Structure 1
Amino acid sequence: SVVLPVAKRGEDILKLIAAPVSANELNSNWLYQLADAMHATMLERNGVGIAAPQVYISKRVIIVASNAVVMVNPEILEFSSEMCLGEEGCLSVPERGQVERAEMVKVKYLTLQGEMVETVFQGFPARIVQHEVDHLNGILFVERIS
């Protein structure tokens, strides 16, 4: 049910490298409750994704929802050299911007139950993925512009 407070540009939490979710957390009430609160917060703000650092949780959890998918410890395995520009805004940057992304990405991640999945995204979902994974590595979208 909970909507979490969101960190804004300037706050140091957003510039860290987020720590991996551990094995013990997989399939826990702990992790389901985190994911649920992140999903509620994204919904309240009209987001199509969210990353844990943005709700002060320095853990590698994102949600992508252009059904909403929860990804634990995601890794982008390859980017296409084919690029595309999209307009991005960020819940943490209250300034929107035109940003180049790989048109396609191959990604590996864990579900909340801890099952390994691998998949490709194209177009907008793929931009969402790259934006959220950027949050996990301490990067805001404005740093990908200039």
Structure 2
Amino acid sequence: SVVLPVAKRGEDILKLIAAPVSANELNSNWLYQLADAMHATMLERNGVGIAAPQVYISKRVIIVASRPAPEMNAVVMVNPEILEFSSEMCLGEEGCLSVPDERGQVERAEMVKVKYLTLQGEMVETVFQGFPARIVQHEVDHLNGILFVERI
């Protein structure tokens, strides 16, 4: 697997709205390869999530992978949409692979309901709670051109 270089704060790739994955790209070796390189890069940097823009790819693909932090199976999400944010809020320390040695506290929704496509192109809707929810929110923020430092 390839470990990819990661963009840092100050690079404007992080400030765009990433383009949706088109229909022809679903279930393609192009998309599987992209996701595998993201995944490998996330593991090599000890991240618990990653977004394509952070590897210079302005496409709506994220990975949510909470691990020590509670432990989940990693989930790849293509064109994710948060359909509902809870009004209940949780605060917690966040970091970012794109913002080396800078931590802060961000208020996030405690639960989100998210609709996304798998790499094959199947639609799934999943509710996230707690730390996994914060990860989803942070990564969707990356796809929209927002760093966490802007929500401190």
Deviations 1:68-95 (A, max 9, x none): 1000000000100100001000000010
**Helix, strand or coil: the match of 1:58?**
coil
Deviations 1:1-59 (A, max 9, x none): 10000000000000000000001110000000000000000000000000000000000
- Counterpart for residue 84 of structure 2: 78
CA RMSD of superposed structures (Å) = 0.4
Structure 2, unmatched stretches of 5+, are 67-72
Deviations 1:89-120 (A, max 9, x none): 00000101111000000000000000000010
Q: Number of aligned pairs?
A: 145
Cα distance in 2 for residues equivalent to 1:65 and 1:12: 26
TM-score normalized by structure 2? 0.95
Which 4+ residue blocks in structure 1 deviate beyond 2 angstroms? Answer: none
Structure 1, unmatched stretches of 5+, are none
TM-score normalized by structure 1? 0.99
Cα distance in 2 for residues equivalent to 1:144 and 1:77: 20
Shift of 1:60: 0.2
**Helix, strand or coil: the match of 2:8?**
coil
Cα distance in 1 for residues equivalent to 2:38 and 2:144: 18
- 1:18-29 paired onto structure 2 within 5 Å: 18-29=18-29
**Helix, strand or coil: the match of 2:141?**
helix
Cα distance in 2 for residues equivalent to 1:72 and 1:131: 15
